[PDB]
Amino acid sequence: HMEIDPKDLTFLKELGTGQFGVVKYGKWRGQYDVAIKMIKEGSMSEDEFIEEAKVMMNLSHEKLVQLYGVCTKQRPIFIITEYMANGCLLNYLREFQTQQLLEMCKDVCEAMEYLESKQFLHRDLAARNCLVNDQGVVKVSDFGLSRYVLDDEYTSSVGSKFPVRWSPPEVLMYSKFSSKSDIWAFGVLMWEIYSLGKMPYERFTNSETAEHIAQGLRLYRPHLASEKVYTIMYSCWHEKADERPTFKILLSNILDVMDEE
Numbered sequence: 001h002m003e004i005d006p007k008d009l010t011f012l013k014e015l016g017t018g019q020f021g022v023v024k025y026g027k028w029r030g031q032y033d034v035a036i037k038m039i040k041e042g043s044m045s046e047d048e049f050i051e052e053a054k055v056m057m058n059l060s061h062e063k064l065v066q067l068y069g070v071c072t073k074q075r076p077i078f079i080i081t082e083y084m085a086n087g088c089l090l091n092y093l094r095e096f097q098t099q100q101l102l103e104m105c106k107d108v109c110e111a112m113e114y115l116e117s118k119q120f121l122h123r124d125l126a127a128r129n130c131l132v133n134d135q136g137v138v139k140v141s142d143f144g145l146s147r148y149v150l151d152d153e154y155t156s157s158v159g160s161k162f163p164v165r166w167s168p169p170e171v172l173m174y175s176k177f178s179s180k181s182d183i184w185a186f187g188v189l190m191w192e193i194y195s196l197g198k199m200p201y202e203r204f205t206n207s208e209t210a211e212h213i214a215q216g217l218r219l220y221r222p223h224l225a226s227e228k229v230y231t232i233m234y235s236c237w238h239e240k241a242d243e244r245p246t247f248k249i250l251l252s253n254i255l256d257v258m259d260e261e
């Protein structure tokens with residue numbers, strides 16, 4: 001537990017509004033640049049999140065957005081994190097050489113291999129919650145947070161905000177989350193990266209996407225992805241969770257394609 005005193009925070013710029021409300025840029029104890037997420041009441045199970053936040057502090061990796069602490073002796077609670085000046089990867093992609101696109105995949109895969117080693121599920125990996133720092137390094141953010149979301153539009157499988165397009169068959173059929181459902185989502189993320197932020201299965205509704213996936217249909221090769229890169233993303237989408245690679249394997253596959261291309 002790392003309780004941050006709000007008196008040690010400054011509020012310097014408004015970054016916008018996310019799923020949980022207002023996000024600000026500020027400084028913590030004049031030392032760290034931070035993002036301050038102000039968690040609107042009724043949007044998150046705070047008690048359950050606060051228990052898990054102690055586990056989230058201990059997660060430390062260069063490619064994971066660092067949790068610095070929380071402000072919980074008030075409502076709304078604040079989540080204090082590492083500041084990523086270029087915002088989310090989806091908007092960064094939408095605003096590159098093929099080598100830079102693979103380095104973005106490598107960055108995320110390093111973070112995911114670390115989470116996989118800690119048996120910590122992200123649960124909602126996608127370009128919208130990967131963040132980009134001032135040097136163009138991509139880092140994974142909001143890992144594990146979707147388990148504490150209270151809005152039905154995000155939690156229900158038929159909700160308007162459920163990430164159907166990033167979900168494997170066992171999630172759509174049984175809500176069975178595992179390291180292998182994070183692998184599936186990672187493949188969709190690689191597709192997003194190589195498609196410069198296009199929506200996956202854009203031609204389909206969420207209901208039509210679940211049906212397409214049930215028939216064995218998969219996302220097509222983006223033109224910026226080579227055959228070797230597409231083989232990696234496609235390996236993430238095996239119908240059987242047990243036949244999907246680990247993040248450890250994926251990272252080795254990515255490093256091989258980099259050295260070769």
Ligand SMILES: Cc1c(-c2c(F)cc(C(N)=O)c3[nH]c4c(c23)CC[C@H](C(C)(C)O)C4)cccc1-n1c(=O)c2cccc(F)c2n(C)c1=O
Nearest residue numbers: 015016017018019023035082083084085086087088090128
């Ligand atoms: C990421 C995000 C943040 C956000 C955050 F949380 C954490 C940090 C960090 N740790 O530093 C952070 N840093 C910056 C932002 C930001 C935003 C951009 C800033 C600049 C300086 C570049 O203007 C820099 C804040 C509000 C909304 C969203 N946001 C989006 O911007 C977004 C887009 C498409 C699609 C989506 F789904 C999106 N969603 C849902 C969403 O929450």
